[model samples]
Target: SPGIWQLDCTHLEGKVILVAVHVASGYIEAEVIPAETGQETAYFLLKLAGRWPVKTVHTDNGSNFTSAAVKAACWWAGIKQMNKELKKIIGQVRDQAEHLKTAVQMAVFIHNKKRKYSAGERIVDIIATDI
Candidate 1:
């Protein structure tokens, strides 16, 4: 896990949007929160923990991520913060927040569906087999 980073909220109606990306798989997870707080960060992480077997986490030096509560929760979950740079290709897309989220989610879904992990295996195929 390459850490959770807050995306630029400049055009997203001032709402704080957090993004977590799996470095190896290119799997993306995101949250659009009301504010940047430790509680919000913890909530987002907890939800992710339920979905994935999150072992290690990395985050920036943001105050929200550096709080003691979040740190304690991470420790309990056996997750560590490595603090890594998240590389994102920025684009100017003017749209409502809901529409933007839908588009981003659709893009992520399509990417995961089409991701060629090996000679002829897609990520979705691997996941389906795991089930």
Candidate 2:
């Protein structure tokens, strides 16, 4: 699906935040990482493994996203990392570490519920194929 998960990283309170969105469905997956290292980013991807039908990834040209761990992770899982095509994912965050995490989560929850474009199909419906 073209709506496959698109991954990106952002910041909050000096820590890195991992953000993934199913483009069309507008469903979000986020995590707060202590560091912006490649290994950390790969770990986040692995975390979403079975829960998502993450076939092809849409993400930036950032070093962490392009690291060998990320590349090899996809290779082993047979998921395509659309590294060939570039994209955008800058999200609009908090201060304290705990606040940072829940803020991201809360915002994502609201977005998944309140956002709409077409007939306003629920995110759960648009993504049930993967579920």
Candidate 3:
């Protein structure tokens, strides 16, 4: 959610670069040669994943995210790649803005308390939910 990671190379006049980062943690996991228009950004993403196995990735409408190379890597890695455009292609029902806001907040709340993977278990199960 921080704009610090968002690259604006518009001023630097060199190789156009794209960076992928984790919004919640502000982790920079990928930095790749910017693929030209129509080229999938996933190509670069794949190389980056070698450093870390990503179960999922969230990106906007970029050719890299939609590239065949990236899709193949995701399939091979058993990683679920989520994109807004991809969601629309599948005819996914979109939630209202407020609903999405609430859902994100709930997820973060749960994440903060339950960062550990529990195989479908919740923190409230062991401790009082009222807390």
The number of the candidate with the highest TM-score is 2
Q: lDDT tens string, model 2, 38-82?
A: 788777777776676677787775565678988777777667761
Which of 1 and 3 is the better model by lDDT? Answer: 1
Compared with the true structure, what per-residue lDDT tens digits does model 1 show for residues 34-94? 7777877787777777766676775554555677778777777766661122212222222
Can you rank all candidates by TM-score, best first?
2, 1, 3
In candidate 3, stretches whose alpha carbon ends up further than 4 angstroms from where it belongs are 1-14, 29-34, 37-40, 62-64, 82-131
Score each candidate by Cα lDDT.
Answer: 0.52, 0.63, 0.39
Native-to-model Cα distance after best TM-score fit, residue 127 in candidate 1, in Å = 8.5
Report the number of clashing residue pairs per model. Answer: 1, 0, 5
Pick by lDDT: 1 or 2, better one: 2
Residue-level lDDT of model 3, residues 23-44, one tens digit each, is 4343332222433432345455
Instruction: Kindly report which residue pairs in candidate 3 clash with one another.
Output: 40-63, 40-64, 41-63, 41-64, 42-64
Candidate 1 Cα outliers beyond 4 Å, as residue runs: 1-11, 82-99, 114-131
